[PDB]
C-alpha cells in the first residue's frame, strides 16, 4: 500500500549514522516481543525477505526485568557463539513460561541445555567481544531512543509504526510488515 510518514512509520528526530540498515530492539522479558518474534515470526519473515547483503542487527534492552542487563549480556553471548536460534526460544521460555531463570547461573544453565559447551560460555561471557556487543546494544538503545519493545528502525532514520500496519491476519501482518520494510529500504 502507500507508505507515508506517520502511517506505517515515523521519522527519528535525531538519526543515527553508520547504523545497520535494520536494527531490531527486544527484551526476553517482553510478552509482546515473544508474541512478535516467536509466535508470529515477524522479524524472521522480515529477515527472509530483505535484499541480499542487507546489514541487520538485533539488540536486547536492559530496561525490562530484574535481570534486564544480565539478559542483554546473554544475548551478546548468543551472538558471539552464533547460537541465537538455539537459545532464543529457551531464554524466552525460561523467563516467561516457566520462570525458571532466576539468576545468572540459570542463564548459564540455559545455554548449556541448549547445547553450548560450558567452557565456551565461560570463555565468552566476559570476553572483549561480548563486552563490545554489550556496549553496542546499550548505545544503540540510547541513540535510537528506544523506550518500548518490540521496535525496529530503518537506515537509522525511520521508526516502524507497528500499530500502523494493517492485516486481516497475523500471518498477513508479518508479510505485510515485511512488505513495508523493503519499501523503506529502497527509499
Amino acid at each position: 500500500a502507500d507508505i507515508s510518514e506517520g502511517k506505517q512509520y515515523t521519522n527519528l528526530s535525531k538519526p543515527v549514522a553508520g547504523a545497520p540498515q535494520v536494527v531490531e530492539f527486544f527484551s526476553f522479558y517482553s510478552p509482546h516481543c515473544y508474541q512478535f518474534s516467536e509466535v508470529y515470526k515477524v522479524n524472521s519473515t522480515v529477515e527472509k525477505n530483505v535484499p541480499e547483503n542487507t546489514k541487520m542487527a538485533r539488540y536486547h534492552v536492559d530496561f525490562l526485568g530484574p535481570l534486564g542487563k544480565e539478559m542483554t549480556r546473554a544475548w551478546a553471548v548468543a551472538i558471539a557463539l552464533g547460537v541465537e536460534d538455539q537459545v532464543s526460544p529457551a531464554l524466552f521460555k525460561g523467563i516467561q513460561e516457566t520462570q525458571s531463570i532466576r539468576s545468572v547461573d540459570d542463564i548459564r544453565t540455559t545455554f548449556i541445555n541448549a547445547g553450548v559447551k560450558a567452557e565456551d560460555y565461560d570463555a565468552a561471557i566476559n570476553s572483549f567481544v561480548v563486552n563490545s556487543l554489550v556496549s553496542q546494544q546499550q548505545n544503540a538503545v540510547t541513540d535510537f531512543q528506544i523506550n518500548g519493545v518490540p521496535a525496529m528502525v530503518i537506515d537509522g532514520k525511520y521508526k516502524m509504526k507497528n500499530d500502523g500496519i494493517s492485516a486481516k491476519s497475523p500471518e498477513e501482518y508479518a508479510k505485510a510488515y515485511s512488505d513495508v520494510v523493503n519499501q523503506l529500504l529502497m527509499k
Binding site: 517482553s30 516481543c33 508474541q35 518500548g148 519493545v149 518490540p150 507497528n162 500496519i165 501482518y173
Partner: peptide, 7 residues
C-alpha cells in the same frame, strides 16, 4: 496485539 508494546 501489535497495537501496543512493552515499555
Amino acid at each position: 496485539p501489535w497495537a501496543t508494546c512493552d515499555s
